[PDB]
């Protein structure tokens, strides 16, 4: 019965964790778009 409350509460926590890592990997995407232009005109 109350396990459904646990499911409902942890579904949005894992979604929030997915979004929290989503902003982090977006920052890493910005970093890798910075770094691919470095070797592009290194010479």
């Amino acid at each position: 019965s109350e396990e459904r409350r646990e499911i409902a509460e942890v579904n949005k926590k894992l979604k929030q964790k997915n979004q929290q890592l989503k902003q982090i990997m977006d920052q890493l995407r910005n970093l890798i778009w910075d770094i691919n232009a470095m070797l592009a005109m290194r010479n």
């Binding site: 929290q20 902003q23 982090i24 920052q27 970093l31 910075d34 470095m38």
Partner: protein, 58 residues
């Protein structure tokens, strides 16, 4: 006097101007903006860690 004459004769016929050709410092500084970009990545990952901080307590 002979030493003076030899010193001036060894240095006589090389009288001209001299260009310091090439920009070695321009290529030398080319590591430093990559280094400050690394520092920008360092502060970015430090902010990543600081954003990781507050979800631990709550």
């Amino acid at each position: 006097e002979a030493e003076l004459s030899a010193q001036i004769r060894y240095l006589t016929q090389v009288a001209t101007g001299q260009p310091h050709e090439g920009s070695s410092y321009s290529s030398r500084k080319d590591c430093q903006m990559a280094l400050k970009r690394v520092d920008y990545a360092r502060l970015k990952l430090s902010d990543v860690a600081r954003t990781c901080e507050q979800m631990l307590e709550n």
